[PDB]
Structures are given as structure tokens and as C-alpha cells.
Amino acid sequence: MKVRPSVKPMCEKCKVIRRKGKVMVICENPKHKQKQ
């Protein structure tokens, strides 16, 4: 998981979602998991 204030798609497969009022991107590529 990357935890950073700047969370944004790193490839075309990256999806930006919100869980529990936290912006995150989920992706097939696990390196691209990000939580804000």
C-alpha cells in the first residue's frame, strides 16, 4: 500500500474509489494500491 496525500491513477487499469471517507485507488497491479 502507498499511503500519500497525492493519490492518483498510475495506469489505465487504476480505479479511484472511496472507502470510509478515504480516497484510494485499487488496481490489478498491487504496486498501484494507494490510500490517501
Binding region for RNA (CB under 7 A): 1-3, 15, 17-21, 26, 30-31, 33, 35
What is the DSSP pairing of strand 34-35 with strand 2-3?
parallel
Rule CB under 5 A: say whether 13 interacts with Zn ion: yes
| Grid cell for residue 8 | 492518483
**Residue 29 in the binding site for Zn ion (CB under 5 A):** yes
| Cα–Cα dist 9/36, whole Å | 12
Minimum CB separation of residue 10 from Zn ion in Å reads 5
**What one-character DSSP code corresponds to residue 28?**
S
Question: What residues line the site for Zn ion (CB under 5 A)?
Answer: 10-11, 13-14, 27, 29, 32
